[PDB]
Structure 1
Amino acid sequence: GLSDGEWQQVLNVWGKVEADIAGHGQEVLIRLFTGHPETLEKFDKFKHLKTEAEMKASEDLKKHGTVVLTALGGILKHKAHAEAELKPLAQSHATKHKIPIKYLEFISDAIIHVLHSKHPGDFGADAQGAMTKALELFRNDIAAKYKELGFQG
């Protein structure tokens, strides 16, 4: 649901996070724990942290903050990149070409057929099952954008 400009805005502020990932992560976890103490109960390794001051002093709360924001930064970058790639394809296939999801199923079946035909050795039952699932995820991704665009696929 984000424009390329909106994802640039998300990644722009994320650059500022990366300038001090530990400080940001410490501040996020302390905001979370102080506002919603029930969340701190989920962290058995932080049972010794009672006060804001103990939280601020904690070497491991700060290290965990880095772990959380490092993971979330990677996820946001990869989501921005996927969207910029998928959105125009979904746009053209909904609005210009008007390709039903059934037709995307036909081409998916055609891809599996050609890979089985050309690579029987390296495309056995397990690999064919993997590709079958991956192509269904792709179709589902397109189908979700078709519904956002109001196109009945």
Structure 2
Amino acid sequence: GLSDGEWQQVLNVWGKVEADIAGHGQEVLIRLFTGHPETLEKFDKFKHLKTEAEMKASEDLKKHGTVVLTALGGILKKKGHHEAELKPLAQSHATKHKIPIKYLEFISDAIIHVLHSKHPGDFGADAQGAMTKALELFRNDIAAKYKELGFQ
């Protein structure tokens, strides 16, 4: 549950992402894959990437980063009223991709890391607080759907 002022912060931060969605999406995925190499094994189309240089050179990885962040931005712009947008993603991630909730924690922290890395000194303590709360809400509502499905 976020206040109006917290949502305003989230959507202000998101404007930074929307100026370069592909660059942000690329770096989020590279941070996930390099920090948590077991996550790479869930992607049949990226498992061939052995080095970070290959990851950086991959245009398909940048494309997927755009898909991921476009979906997240659509959810965030709903300010919590995201049941219709979140349900298909929870279902596909539990039943088809088999993504444990832990990996959604990993990517949430990776988003925070990338924002500080690309905007040092311009991602303030209030903005970090509000973005963190929004990613927690996203993760918590997915977790509820995971429990319904019995997925661990």
TM-score when scaled to structure 2?
0.53
**Structure 2: how far apart are the matches of 1:103 and 1:48?**
20
Contact residue 90 and residue 146 of structure 1 kept, 8 A: yes
The structure 1 segments of at least 4 consecutive aligned residues displaced by more than 2 Å after TM superposition are 79-152
Structure 1 residues 143 and 52: CA distance shift in structure 2, 3 A: closer
- Highest RCO, 1 vs 2 (Cα 8 Å, sep ≥ 6): 2
Over the matched positions of the two proteins, sequence identity in percent amounts to 98
Instruction: Specify the alignment match of 1:116 in structure 2.
Output: 116
Structure 1 residues 35 and 74: CA distance shift in structure 2, 3 A: same
TM-score when scaled to structure 1?
0.53
Structure 1 residues 31 and 117: CA distance shift in structure 2, 3 A: closer
Larger radius of gyration: 1
Structure 1 residues 3 and 50: CA distance shift in structure 2, 3 A: same
**Higher percent of residues as helix:** 1
Structure 1 residues 7 and 90: CA distance shift in structure 2, 3 A: farther
Structure 1 residues 90 and 67: CA distance shift in structure 2, 3 A: closer
Contact residue 28 and residue 114 of structure 2 kept, 8 A: no
State the Cα deviation string for residues 7-63 of structure 1 (Å, max 9, x = none): 000000001100000000000000000000000100001122111110000010000
Contact residue 26 and residue 65 of structure 2 kept, 8 A: yes
- Name stretches of at least 5 consecutive residues in structure 2 with no aligned partner: none
- Name stretches of at least 5 consecutive residues in structure 1 with no aligned partner: none
Higher mean alpha-carbon deviation, 96-105 vs 43-52, is at: 96-105
Structure 1 residues 14 and 75: CA distance shift in structure 2, 3 A: same
Structure 1 residues 81 and 50: CA distance shift in structure 2, 3 A: same
Higher mean alpha-carbon deviation, 119-128 vs 89-98, is at: 119-128
